Amino acid sequence: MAKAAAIGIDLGTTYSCVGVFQHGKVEIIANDQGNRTTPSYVAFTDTERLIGDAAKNQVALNPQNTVFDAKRLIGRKFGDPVVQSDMKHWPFQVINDGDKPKVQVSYKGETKAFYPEEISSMVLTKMKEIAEAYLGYPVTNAVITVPAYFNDSQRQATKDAGVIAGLNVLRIINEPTAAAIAYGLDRTGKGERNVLIFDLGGGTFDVSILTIDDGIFEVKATAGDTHLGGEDFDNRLVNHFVEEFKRKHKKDISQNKRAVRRLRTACERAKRTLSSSTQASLEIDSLFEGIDFYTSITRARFEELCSDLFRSTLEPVEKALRDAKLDKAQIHDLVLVGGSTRIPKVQKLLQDFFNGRDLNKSINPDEAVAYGAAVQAAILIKSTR
């Protein structure tokens, strides 16, 4: 029943996803709001603790007590230059507890501090409760994914988050390995298969090159930009609309925090529309000083606004190819991961770089990792019996 059941969890920087393999198919489980992906946010309020969508929805009103980016802190020392640099950009407090970072917040009127693994355990608990609500029984066996460049300390702190959340962690697998499993790239029989995983998410960009030799996975190279993702494209749209508002009304909205945030959420939505339509409309009632902002943008203008950012994704691809000591024609498969890979210009740039090659993109790219983790979790739980 429950003991013979296992889930796959993609524990992401900005979003998390849970899948289950049953009756010969993967089901990506929707949360109580009907979304197949859940924001990796935890909010601490005057009455409750919020996780996911509810936490992300109140981030504007409560920024000091809304934690996100815990994955950037997990398994790291407070003194680590990555931690010290990132701390300057978060609205929540990060403190030092014996060279280990803790997030300090106000919760139900009291000062509380949490280890990053305790924050990630709250995200994992939510994913576990989403699976339980779908299945009708508690499921405790799980496969949890991590980036391929995570070291032993980051892998151990992820497994600890899983333990705190009440999960029996069957395995910690690499995100690009879960993605190649999703496409069945480890079931092509004999001979070494070279796979490139292009993973463009909300806040990070990762390129991974894997060799799959008779079912055995080997990471040949990892490259990328830890501070490049979908949120940089939204900000490029934001800047354009702030400048358009200034030209139409002779008014600078940039200092109005509420006006900028409503513009940001509308830009994110418009950006997603631009992946399937050649234009998108913004309909913001009373944006600033009672002025409605009803405008549109083409895909061609959006592509111009992000042109340099889209082109910058090809330098880590080249870098990963040289590190792996492989030419373009030696790559058998190209896999797309992350919601941002839905952008047509991104796909065209990657396909042109690989000389007109077909891309593996039939599985929702923001769900491919959870999909593969769910397949692995089913195989692992069957072998355990």
Ligand X SMILES: Nc1ncnc2c1nc(Cl)n2[C@@H]1O[C@H](CO)[C@@H](O)[C@H]1O
Would you name the residues annotated as active-site residues? 10, 71, 175, 199
Amino acid at 25: K
Identify whether the C-beta of residue 137 lies closer than 8 Å to the C-beta of residue 2.
yes
Q: How far apart are CA 51 and CA 17, in angstroms?
A: 14
Among 45, 141, 208, 340, binds ligand X (CB under 6 A): 340
Closer CB to ligand X, residue 104 or residue 239?
239
Number of residues that bind ligand X (CB under 6 A): 16
Closer CB to ligand X, residue 51 or residue 321?
51
Q: Does 366 bind ligand X (CB under 6 A)?
A: yes
3-state SS assignment for residue 363: coil
* CA–centroid distance for 99 within its chain: 27
Q: How far apart are CA 351 and CA 153, in angstroms?
A: 36
Q: How far apart are CA 320 and CA 221, in angstroms?
A: 5
Query: Is 125 within any annotated ligand binding site?
Result: no
Q: Does 201 bind ligand X (CB under 6 A)?
A: yes
Q: How far apart are CA 117 and CA 1, in angstroms?
A: 29
The one segment of 74-82, 164-172, 225-233, 280-288 that binds ligand X by CB under 6 A: 225-233
Other C-beta atoms closer than 10 Å to the C-beta of 281 total 12
Query: Is 339 within any annotated ligand binding site?
Result: yes
Q: Does 339 bind ligand X (CB under 6 A)?
A: yes
The one segment of 169-177, 188-196, 287-295, 332-340 that binds ligand X by CB under 6 A: 332-340
3-state SS assignment for residue 250: coil
CB of 376 to ligand X, least distance (A): 21
Among 126, 262, 271, 345, binds ligand X (CB under 6 A): 271
DSSP assignment of 130-161 equals HHHHHHSS---EEEEEE-TT--HHHHHHHHHH
CB of 231 to ligand X, least distance (A): 6
Annotated binding-site positions: 12-15, 71, 202-204, 268-275, 339-342
Binding site for ligand X (CB under 6 A): 15, 201-202, 229-231, 268, 271-272, 275, 338-340, 342-343, 366
